From a paper:
Mixed lineage leukemia (MLL) family enzymes, including MLL1-4/KMT2A-2D, SET1A/KMT2F, and SET1B/KMT2G, are the major histone lysine 4 (K4) methyltransferases in mammals. The MLL family enzymes share an evolutionarily conserved catalytic Su(Var), Enhancer of Zeste, Trithorax (SET) domain14 as well as four highly conserved SET-interacting proteins, i.e., RbBP5 (retinoblastoma-binding protein 5), ASH2L (Absent, small, homeotic disks-2-like), WDR5 (WD40 repeat-containing protein 5), and DPY30 (DumPY protein 30). Here we report the single-particle cryo-EM structure of the human MLL1 core complex bound to the NCP. Importantly, we show that the MLL1 core complex docks on the NCP through concurrent interactions of ASH2L/RbBP5 with nucleosomal DNA and histone H4.
A recombinant human MLL1 core complex (MLL1RWSAD) containing RbBP5 (residues 1–538), WDR5 (residues 25–330), MLL1SET (residues 3762–3969), ASH2L (residues 1–534), and DPY30 (residues 1–99) was reconstituted in vitro. The cryo-EM structure of MLL1RWSAD-NCP was determined at a resolution of 6.2 Å. The overall architecture of the MLL1RWSAD-NCP complex revealed that MLL1RWSAD anchors at the edge of the NCP through two core components, RbBP5 and ASH2L. Within the NCP, we observed that DNA superhelical location 7 (SHL7) and SHL1.5, together with H4 N-terminal tail, were involved in the interaction with MLL1RWSAD. Distinct from many of the previously reported NCP-recognizing proteins or protein complexes, the MLL1 core complex did not interact with the acidic-patch region of the NCP. The MLL1RWSAD-NCP model revealed that ASH2L IDRs interacted with the SHL7 of nucleosomal DNA. Our MLL1RWSAD-NCP model pinpointed a short stretch of positively charged residues (i.e., K205/R206/K207) in the ASH2L Linker-IDR with potential to make contacts with nucleosomal DNA. Given the binding of RbBP5 and ASH2L at the edge of the NCP (SHL1.5 and SHL7), the catalytic MLL1SET domain was positioned at the nucleosome dyad with the active site of the MLL1SET domain pointing outward. The distance between Lys37 on each H3 tail and the active site of MLL1SET was ~60 Å, allowing active-site access to H3 K4 and K9, but not to H3K27. More importantly, the active site near nucleosome dyad had almost equal accessibility to K4 residues on both H3 tails.
Author numbering:
A (entry chain M), G (entry chain I): 12 to 118
B (entry chain N), H (entry chain J): 29 to 121
C (entry chain G), F (entry chain K): 37 to 134
D (entry chain H), E (entry chain L): 20 to 101
DNA sequence: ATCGGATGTATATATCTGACACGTGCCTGGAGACTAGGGAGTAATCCCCTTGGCGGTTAAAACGCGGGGGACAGCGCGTACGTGCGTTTAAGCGGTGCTAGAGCTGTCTACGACCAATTGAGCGGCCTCGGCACCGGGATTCTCGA
């Protein structure tokens, strides 16, 4: 009996075994549903895809292959729903997305 | 000491979305911390709602409901659809 | 004849390049000494990670630029380009920091 | 080795640098020390809470994960440190 | 039974009553509807999240404990309802 | 000759008695109808507890008087006794509601 | 087979056994410290004492035997420490503490 | 259906502090909800800390530490004293 | 700055009551007693990050130095907002009546729990090399006096 990872049968990239391990070790319920780690890991993969895509957009806009935290912070403050999700979150080497106020301009 | 992370899967899904891109290990650690944050968030919320439902079993319905509670609008919608498709795929075999 | 840019202009470009830059704007050692001084108040002779104190200073400066930002905004609502301490105080007030 | 008065070690040029980063044009003097105070007050919490963690950690050195869980408990979570 | 336009059911006298409770002397007109909007927006979240609870609750009626856990999750917790 | 109190004075006493009183200042039925109208947007024909909706209205009005309060404060920093919508908007802005 | 509850063994009121069962069913840790329920319940006893005491202070300040939630709001708004403890907390039938700003008074 | 509460205990401590002063049921349930909330606060915090300590057991030291995290200054101090008292009174059993 | 009048508000009173303190019988969670494992505690070891110092640099901070720029104070007006009084209006009491749906019990069953046997996905560690960071230099564009 060959052993394949359950994420393969889920066709995903993040290790659902490690997921369910953290789940049981997380003291959330007496017994975790079978497909619940699968579902949440799928959500995780999707959102990671979104954020990494935004980061790659920013970096290539800046003509950069290696993506520095600044790109990610900019994308964060560029996605309104993601920002809402993460506005309460602080970002190392984030800096501030360029924001210029009106009355600040000269004449 | 055997320490576990996800940066390998980060690189994987990166190539899946951007094959010609590099990352700062700093940024990888940031993203992994973000992974951990969202994971603990969703897990705590699910456990709490199950407690409200007096449920000792956290299943995919809990998952979807808690994501909807957490993610806004199309973020939540796409995430729900994706988790649904994935659990369907896994349950197909 | 000597040239001098009009006021703010140089500071304006400073703003522009600082929103351009991302690194810290605080000297490391003074911040670290301040942190250890604060630490000995609660308990003396406590050690730290350089990573830990880097996190402290980064997170601080983040909170600080956020405070400067929304206090700038408030001063806009105050119709002034100069900042006033009351702006910061009331900002914290709205920030629930009072 | 008893420390003191590193609060004024914060240079007014540093403060105005942070302000320019925040997009501020004109500033008054009365702010800086006031600023400093706030700064102190702000960190006033976290380190203590942090070492509180280290308190329960039964250790002499203070780690990043301390302030991580603090800012978390302080609702100001940060990424990039485990 | 399709409902509508109860937002303007909020009377300007009610709004100014709340304002006086907040300790406000002079008010402009432009606020009220604006106010209303905010109000809507505010509740815009909770009910949904609340019924989201009721969503997982698999029930047709909506309960207080729903909004309790919402305001909790919304960091605006309330007492006196279990 | 008819008497009329100076402006605000009556409203001032209203403020005083409202800080004195504690009960609601919103008519129940209109609020309830509004809530059900909002509800049918997400799902139609949903029932409610009177306790639930009482909680909704109380918590709302609390948030609302808090908003009115700190917007009053901001208008103090705006040096006006009249309120301006921008005050509310920027207050939410500082309240992270933007 | 002499019986004596842990609350009496601590000479206190809050039910150590009940709160122990509660935390057990709360899924926070696998094993528990037997004295932790005692300790926490004592803390609850203390804080409850202070808050109810201030509540009763306002109550008989208003010639009120039975305490009203308005007393509770006033109490929690007066004390700095308790207010800080419950800043982002709301109270049913709370209302607002008396507060008039300086410039609000006519000159 | 039996629904547990603490109105008995809150009334007990009321008398212990104010035998004269009465109580309203509304404010009673307010007290009950509040203590439930703060108990969940301390529970989650202590569990989080112990998970950081990776210690599957939850003891009183955790409680002291986490309430110190929770309470604004002197309260905690006062608090911990009686708490200690309690366990001392219970360890002296 | 005062007095008079208007008005609004704190008080005593009376009674009504319905929350509310109080007491019950009955239930089960809590106490009491007993068993196991194994998380926790202790200790010796290693490492190794930190904390300490030392010297050279300059970019950075301190300080000074005009000086135009706006904070601010004042001053006119006017429009928008309190107000008191009109008006009409849904709000609330309340009480009725139906049931849809919470809300409870009783199954029975699929479903992780768990353990055991197996291992390859993954992780610490080791090269490696190329975008990237820095630098110098040239060309571009904003800005402040015509």
């Amino acid at each position: 009996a060959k052993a394949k990872t359950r994420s393969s049968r889920a066709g995903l990239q993040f290790p659902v075994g490690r997921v369910h391990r953290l789940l049981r070790k997380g003291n959330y319920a007496e017994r975790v549903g079978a497909g619940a780690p699968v579902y949440l890991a799928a959500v995780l993969e999707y959102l990671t895809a979104e954020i990494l895509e935004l980061a790659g957009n920013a970096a290539r806009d800046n003509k950069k292959t290696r993506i520095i935290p600044r790109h990610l912070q900019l994308a964060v403050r560029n996605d309104e729903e993601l920002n809402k999700l993460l506005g309460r979150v602080t970002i190392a080497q984030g800096g501030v997305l360029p924001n210029i106020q009106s009355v600040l301009l000269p004449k | 000491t055997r320490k576990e992370s996800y940066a390998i899967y980060v690189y994987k899904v990166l190539k899946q979305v951007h094959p010609d891109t590099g990352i700062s290990s700093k940024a990888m650690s940031i993203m992994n911390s973000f992974v951990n944050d969202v994971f603990e968030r969703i897990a705590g919320e699910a456990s709490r709602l199950a407690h409200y439902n007096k449920r000792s079993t956290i299943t995919s319905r809990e998952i979807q409901t808690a994501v909807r509670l957490l993610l806004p609008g199309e973020l939540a919608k796409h995430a729900v659809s994706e988790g649904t498709k994935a659990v369907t795929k896994y349950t197909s075999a | 004849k000597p040239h001098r840019y009009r006021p703010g202009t140089v500071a304006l470009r400073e703003i522009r390049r600082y929103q351009k830059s991302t690194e810290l704007l605080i000297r490391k050692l003074p911040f670290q000494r301040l942190v250890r001084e604060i630490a000995q108040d609660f308990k003396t002779d406590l050690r730290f990670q350089s990573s830990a104190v880097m996190a402290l200073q980064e997170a601080s400066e983040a909170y600080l630029v956020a405070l400067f930002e929304d206090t700038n905004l408030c001063a806009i609502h105050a119709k002034r380009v100069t900042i006033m301490p009351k702006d910061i105080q009331l900002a914290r007030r709205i920030r629930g920091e009072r | 080795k008893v420390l003191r008065d590193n609060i004024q070690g914060i240079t007014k040029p540093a403060i105005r640098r942070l302000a320019r980063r925040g997009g501020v044009k004109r500033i008054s003097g009365l702010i800086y020390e006031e600023t400093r105070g706030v700064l102190k007050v702000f960190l006033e919490n976290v380190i203590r809470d942090a070492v509180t963690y280290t308190e329960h950690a039964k250790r002499k050195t203070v780690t990043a994960m301390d302030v991580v869980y603090a800012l978390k408990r302080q609702g100001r979570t940060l990424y990039g440190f485990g």
